[PDB]
Amino acid sequence: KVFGRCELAAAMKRHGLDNYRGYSLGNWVCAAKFESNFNTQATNRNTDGSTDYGILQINSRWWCNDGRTPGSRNLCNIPCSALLSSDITASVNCAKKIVSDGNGMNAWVAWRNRCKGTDVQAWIRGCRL
Template sequence: MAALVLLSILACVLVGNMGKIFRRCELAQVLHQAGMDGFRGYSLADWLCMAFHESRFNTDTVDHEADGSTDNGIFQINSRQWCNDYRSSTRNLCHMHCSDLLTSNINDDIVCAMQIVQQPRGMGAW
């Protein structure tokens, strides 16, 4: 019985940390609630288009780049500049682990993306 309880708890923890594929309208609602519609002049449509193009709305997408860096999460945030993947040299400007970008909770992804678009290149960074 104790083993079954432990297994159930472990399953919940693992499922809670797994990625998620958002539906378009669901993601639009999350981004809107986070204040991204109009942030730095970018519409909700801009954010949705970018997220679809980068990850197909999949939060656990990881792309390995030729320079050894990785693009991570729903917005494909690069480890060379923005997060630490512990494999490549990084500036870690968002002060986070790249693995944090791969979960179903995209609050940290949103905070980092908002930081990225405040840079001179704006959404051109993608």
């Protein structure tokens, strides 16, 4: 599924991401835009052999099991394929674990390099929320 900006914002709000660990909704929408272009089916292979999955490009080295990343953990206890679903519940629940782990949204390289320190409220402007 390729979400619309406001459609994704409202989905993320319904799932409890607005101000989750202090990160306003526009941070999460900005991260999703630059990580996956709002596409739940996005995958990208990393140099170490791991793969990033879904709308928030969650890494198989730590967070999900894809059967082909030796020595990795599965801290969200899910198959990585679950992160590609049109239902973002699995991705949101896993993202809450990631952002709670200490480094906040710096876990998402695109957030650090393209959203941090910007007017992220702009990502939810105009949406009925």
